[PDB]
């Protein structure tokens, strides 16, 4: 009937819709696989981890379009985030979509952890899928994140070679206004040392997991995670003026929720 639904035991009347109704999905998490396509597909369909999408390094094309693998209906959670925290939330699996990108990650080469560049074909395939996802759920720019952002002590992915600024120019994810980063730099050289505690407060509020008593090591991983995303020219995890100014400009533009 007119807005009425039948069931075993009861009728539902759907005629009155509440104003306060919002997606359960709020977060888009970017990963790399650190493994080849067939191997990643095997792993992400097994019983320990999964993701909603798997993008090959160079997706095959059909009907003039890159093909991407969907492993898990978006309505359902995938096992991609693990133990995690972002902007007040935990258990990020519950509220996120996870995209896995076939990419080798890091390999230590004479002690120097070297990351692998992202195939431009892959990024090109990613853009329309991210846009559709972001439209569908009205995902806010600051909630397009790296796995490292939501689990900084455990993960680096997708790493400092991931083109966040390029994506931001396509309307995908958060990026600070350059004039405001300069404003907050406030006359300092970019690498001028800044007070670690003060920087960590800002990162906490922007959304990073920061606990009251952390070893220097653990404080470095948080700052490093932030730099890999937002200041990838140097991601050694030391608090400096440029890192702080970026955090300050991000907070000004996107807030904290």
């Amino acid at each position: 009937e007119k807005g009425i639904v039948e069931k075993e035991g009861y009728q539902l009347d759907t005629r009155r819709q509440a104003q306060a109704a919002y997606p359960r999905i709020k977060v888009l998490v970017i990963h790399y696989t650190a493994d080849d396509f067939d191997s990643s597909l095997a792993t992400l369909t097994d019983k320990q981890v999964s993701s909603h999408y798997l993008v090959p390094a160079v997706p095959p094309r059909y009907n003039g379009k890159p093909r991407i693998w969907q492993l898990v209906p978006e309505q359902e959670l995938a096992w991609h985030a693990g133990i995690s925290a972002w902007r007040g939330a935990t258990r990020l699996n519950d509220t996120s979509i996870g995209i896995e990108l076939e990419n080798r990650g890091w390999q230590k080469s004479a002690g120097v952890k070297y990351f692998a560049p992202f195939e431009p074909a892959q990024i090109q395939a990613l853009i329309p899928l991210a846009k559709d996802i972001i439209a569908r759920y009205h995902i806010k720019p600051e909630n397009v994140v790296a796995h490292a952002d939501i689990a900084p002590q455990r993960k680096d992915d997708p790493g400092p070679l991931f083109p966040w600024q390029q994506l931001a120019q396509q309307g995908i994810g958060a990026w600070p206004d350059a004039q405001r980063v300069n404003f907050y730099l406030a006359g300092r050289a970019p690498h001028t040392p800044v007070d670690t505690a003060s920087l960590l407060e800002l990162l906490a509020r922007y959304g990073y997991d920061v606990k009251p008593d952390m070893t220097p090591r653990e404080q470095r991983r948080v700052i490093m995670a932030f730099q890999m995303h937002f200041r990838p020219t140097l991601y050694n995890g030391e608090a400096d003026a440029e890192t702080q100014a970026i955090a300050e400009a991000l907070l000004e533009k996107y807030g904290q929720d």
């Binding site: 650190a34 320990q48 981890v49 096992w79 991609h80 693990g82 896995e100 990650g105 993960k155 992915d157």
Partner: peptide, 4 residues
């Protein structure tokens, strides 16, 4: 990467 991934990773319940």
């Amino acid at each position: 990467x991934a990773x319940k």
